[PDB]
């Protein structure tokens, strides 16, 4: 369906909305929802816990089965699994965990995976539990992704700070 509404257009292909990503997925029924994951697909808190909780833990069982068969992901890597009741597909992407000293440059590698999908509902990778600057995560997204990406930012204060930062980045 991909029926997105109420987004602010930042560039030709990046959009942003002050919204919860699970509530957006339930309203839009997208082809692809992005999970901000770790390499073992152990869905803890933040976006990963929210999506898994909305699938009634189905996402975790599937991920456990995927990892057992295939082994862990690499940082900057991804895998496509079921979106369960939220989306057709879920793209699990691993941003660098800068809190564990992983290389912030792998955020470029992480967002590159979006380019295999016509349209995506996504969060800001690495910007929460993994400790990257949200503004920096938005910049890499804008500089790296060429396909259609609708970003869900649930916190209204972060959203307002992100837009103001983006305007500053664009005019300077
Ligand atoms: N109507 C509604 N129902 C249910 N859940 C909702 C709703 N609206 C929003 N949400 C989302 O439920 C989520 C509850 O908060 P939570 O899952 O705890 O997110 P976090 O605050 O942990 O975000 C993770 C990271 N952000 C920066 C910090 O470093 C955290 O590590 C939060 O994202 C809300 O936006
Ligand atoms: N429900 C929801 N909707 C929208 N945006 C959200 C939500 N929950 C968190 N966020 C925001 O999305 C951003 C991504 O943070 P997070 O979900 O912690 O992902 P990370 O890439 O930083 O960390 C990944 C790790 N968290 C649990 C996973 O199992 C990974 O180990 C950050 O700005 C959060 O405040
Ligand atoms: Na900054
Ligand atoms: Na604000």
Author numbering: 207 to 378
The paper states:
We identified and characterized the structural basis for the observed functional diversification of MacroD-like enzymes and provide for the first time direct evidence for the hydrolysis of PARP14-ADP-ribosylated substrates.
The overall fold is identical to the S2-MacroD:ADPr structure with r.m.s.d. values of 0.155 Å over 155 Cα and 0.152 Å over 149 Cα, respectively. The pyrrolidine C1″ of the molecule outside the binding site (n + 1 position) is positioned 3.3 Å away from the 2′OH of classically bound ADP-HPD (n position) and its orientation is compatible with the expected α-anomeric linkage.
